[PDB]
Amino acid sequence: RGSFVEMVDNLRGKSGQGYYVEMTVGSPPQTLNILVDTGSSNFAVGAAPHPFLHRYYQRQLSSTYRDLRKGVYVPYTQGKWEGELGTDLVSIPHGPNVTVRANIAAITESDKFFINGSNWEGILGLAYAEIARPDDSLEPFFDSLVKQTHVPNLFSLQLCGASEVLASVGGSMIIGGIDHSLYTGSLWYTPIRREWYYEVIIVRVEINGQDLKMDCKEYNYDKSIVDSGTTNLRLPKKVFEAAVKSIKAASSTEKFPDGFWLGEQLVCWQAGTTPWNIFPVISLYLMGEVTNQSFRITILPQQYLRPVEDVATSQDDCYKFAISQSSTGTVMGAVIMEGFYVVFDRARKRIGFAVSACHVHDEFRTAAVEGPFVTLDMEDCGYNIPQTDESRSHHHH
Ligand SMILES: NC1=N[C@@]2(CO1)c1cc(-c3cncc(Cl)c3)ccc1O[C@@H]1COCC[C@H]12
Numbered sequence: 060r061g062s063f064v065e066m067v068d069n070l071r072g073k074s075g076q077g078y079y080v081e082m083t084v085g086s087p088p089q090t091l092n093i094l095v096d097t098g099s100s101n102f103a104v105g106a107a108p109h110p111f112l113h114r115y116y117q118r119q120l121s122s123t124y125r126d127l128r129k130g131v132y133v134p135y136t137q138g139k140w141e142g143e144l145g146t147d148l149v150s151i152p153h154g155p156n157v158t159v160r161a162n163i164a165a166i167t168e169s170d171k172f173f174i175n176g177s178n179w180e181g182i183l184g185l186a187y188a189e190i191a192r193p194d195d196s197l198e199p200f201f202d203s204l205v206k207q208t209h210v211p212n213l214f215s216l217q218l219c220g221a222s223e224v225l226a227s228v229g230g231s232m233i234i235g236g237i238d239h240s241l242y243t244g245s246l247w248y249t250p251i252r253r254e255w256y257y258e259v260i261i262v263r264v265e266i267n268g269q270d271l272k273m274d275c276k277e278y279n280y281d282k283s284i285v286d287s288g289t290t291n292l293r294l295p296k297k298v299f300e301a302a303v304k305s306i307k308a309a310s311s312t313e314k315f316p317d318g319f320w321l322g323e324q325l326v327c328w329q330a331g332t333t334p335w336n337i338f339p340v341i342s343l344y345l346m347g348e349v350t351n352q353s354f355r356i357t358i359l360p361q362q363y364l365r366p367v368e369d370v371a372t373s374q375d376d377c378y379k380f381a382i383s384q385s386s387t388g389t390v391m392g393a394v395i396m397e398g399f400y401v402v403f404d405r406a407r408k409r410i411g412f413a414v415s416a417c418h419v420h421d422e423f424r425t426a427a428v429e430g431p432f433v434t435l436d437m438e439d440c441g442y443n444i445p446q447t448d449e450s451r452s453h454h455h456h
């Protein structure tokens with residue numbers, strides 16, 4: 060292999076509203092646009108009329124649909140979806156040339172799930188069974204794909220970032236391999252700490268080469284994950300505050316409102332005059348495959364300042380600050396992923412990063428992937444989430 064031309068450029072979306080892939084469900088195939096989400100584990104599709112849907116999965120039109128006679132209820136921080144579990148035939152038209160029978164949650168009711176204008180009608184959770192709903196016995200889509208076909212247990216994502224409409228985004232999801240045209244330089248791997256989310260360990264953070272000098276467990280409190288289903292780089296409270304202070308200090312020639320640093324207000328410059336060089340690079344050092352090694356991924360303001368073309372100020376280039384506070388750990392969302400070709404090597408329990416052939420940069424700086432960095436007697440930077448009685452009581456047969 061080494062080339063997967065048919066799968067290149069198979070992702071689309073609107074800026075800040077997620078990346079989606081075309082999928083088919085049912086016999087004959089019904090096409091739907093599906094949000095690619097490495098931060099969840101259910102395949103769920105709109106299956107009833109909704110104000111924001113032009114189309115939905117019509118179960119009655121599929122000769123191959125089977126009802127599982129079981130519902131599923133999925134509340135989360137920003138919304139809720141619920142529906143009926145079933146199985147049907149699924150394919151990815153610009154993916155592997157295979158058809159699999161997968162679990163499909165037919166979304167019958169939701170709140171704040173669908174987005175007006177995002178153009179997606181469902182979600183493809185690519186994470187592990189441990190976080191599937193209702194429970195871990197509901198086989199996720201990728202597991203079914205691997206078990207039913209000869210598709211290698213690996214996928215990779217190249218997310219490429221950007222007056223009346225939001226900017227169109229594009230990218231590639233390569234299923235079953237690595238496409239060498241999508242990256243340059245070295246491909247560096249960090250271990251998947253545990254198979255639930257795509258959990259990783261950050262060992263060090265630098266802002267313009269300056270170490271934040273925190274106990275490294277703070278960087279992974281209470282976890283750090285790689286999440287295509289999050290736009291921002293989200294950082295634990297303490298880390299966020301230290302980062303903002305450092306970025307403010309570096310960009311201090313400009314005095315932005317508090318709203319900007321909160322991601323609640325755009326800041327603008329006259330077209331093509333954005334002073335990129337006043338904003339610092341951000342480096343996250345990730346644990347290497349070798350104990351005592353790390354490598355760093357470095358992003359630019361071109362990644363963490365998101366372009367938004369507002370109607371009133373269409374003469375100007377306007378930006379949203381896309382680093383935000385978390386209480387659920389580090390989330391390496393599109394802000395991180397748009398710099399890199401990211402390999403989800405499930406077979407080898409590791410995540411690969413390389414400089415993306417499509418990342419946004421200037422003639423002075425580039426997003427980078429660099430290593431090795433060796434630390435004598437490296438500490439354990441992993442956080443151990445307190446075990447609840449709820450979690451502990453679960454039997455895992
Ligand atoms: N990983 C992740 N998945 C979440 C939340 O975090 C999500 C995200 C978005 C979404 C909306 N706008 C932009 C993007 Cl990138 C994603 C839309 C729906 C959505 O529902 C998911 C349902 O499962 C829990 C995690 C949810």
Ligand code: NI
Pocket residue numbers: 454456
């Ligand atoms: Ni038991």
